[PDB]
Design a protein around this ligand. Structure first.
Ligand SMILES: *[C@@H]1O[C@H](CO)[C@@H](O[C@@H]2O[C@H](CO)[C@@H](O)[C@H](O)[C@H]2NC(C)=O)[C@H](O)[C@H]1NC(C)=O
Length: 238
């Protein structure tokens, strides 16, 4: 996360870290949405990975950290394909439930739709330098604005982005605050609700007028609810 500061140790109880099984290299964030399910991005999928819950500092672990692994992973399509404007979502059922603790608690799915002009917060253990390779020991947090999706189209002519999407466009027009490498898959919290999943942004991060795309959680409520209810034939919004 560029342009923020270390998160308060109590403000990210739902934030989880995806890391490799062997080197313990952190590669994405994610969000605990109840006692046994996590939402992250489809681009975060790996054949083998672990999920750390209740983590703040990497080297000075919270006493109540828990580790889980995916028992099941769900995607919009059997191909697990996604695009720059939709389908970048993965729902994970944990191998066993977690109990709430000082540093662990889920973020409920959103109950209202996101409103343009809201102020949102992002958080993760990604790079805190727009260019370098400075990865923090603790997660950082920063506030950004929810923009009209139309805003995300013009800055990226190479992607020929369609007029509508299943993503939210968020950032700061003047630059300086942004998601960055290692934060993707993590949550975008807007006006108190879990509204986005970090999908992609530009590199270097936090450039002026280069906002980032976050998969729109709200549009996927039916799909999420149906999978959790045990309807595996559920479909993402067309
Ligand atoms: C999922 O996406 C992959 C990669 O974008 C698709 O595989 C490509 O298919 C096209 C032709 O259909 C070829 O040009 C590429 O060589 C393929 N592989 C690549 C780029 O690695 C695939 O079609 C998609 N799967 C679906 C739609 O089921």
């Amino acid at each position: 996360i560029i342009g923020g500061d270390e998160c308060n140790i109590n403000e990210h109880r739902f934030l989880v870290a995806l890391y490799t099984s062997r080197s313990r290299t952190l590669f994405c964030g994610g969000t605990l949405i109840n006692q046994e399910w996590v939402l992250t991005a489809a681009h975060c999928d790996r054949k083998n990975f672990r999920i750390k819950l209740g983590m703040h500092s990497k080297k000075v672990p919270n006493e109540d950290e828990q580790t889980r692994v995916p028992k099941e992973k769900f995607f919009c399509l059997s191909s697990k394909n996604y695009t720059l404007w939709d389908k970048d979502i993965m729902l994970i059922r944990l191998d066993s439930p977690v109990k709430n603790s000082k540093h662990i608690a889920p973020f409920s799915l959103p109950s209202s739709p996101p409103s343009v002009g809201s102020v949102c917060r992002i958080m993760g253990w990604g790079r805190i330098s727009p260019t370098e390779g400075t990865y923090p020991d603790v997660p950082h947090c920063v506030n950004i604005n929810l923009l009209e999706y139309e805003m995300c189209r013009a800055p990226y002519p190479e992607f020929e982005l369609p007029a509508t999407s299943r993503t939210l466009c968020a950032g700061i027009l003047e630059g300086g605050k942004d998601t960055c490498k290692g934060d993707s898959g993590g949550p975008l919290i807007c006006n108190g609700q879990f509204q986005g999943i970090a999908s992609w942004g530009d590199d270097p991060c936090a450039q002026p007028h280069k906002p980032a795309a976050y998969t729109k959680v709200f549009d996927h409520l039916d799909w999420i609810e149906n999978i959790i209810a045990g309807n595996t034939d559920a479909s993402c919004p067309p």
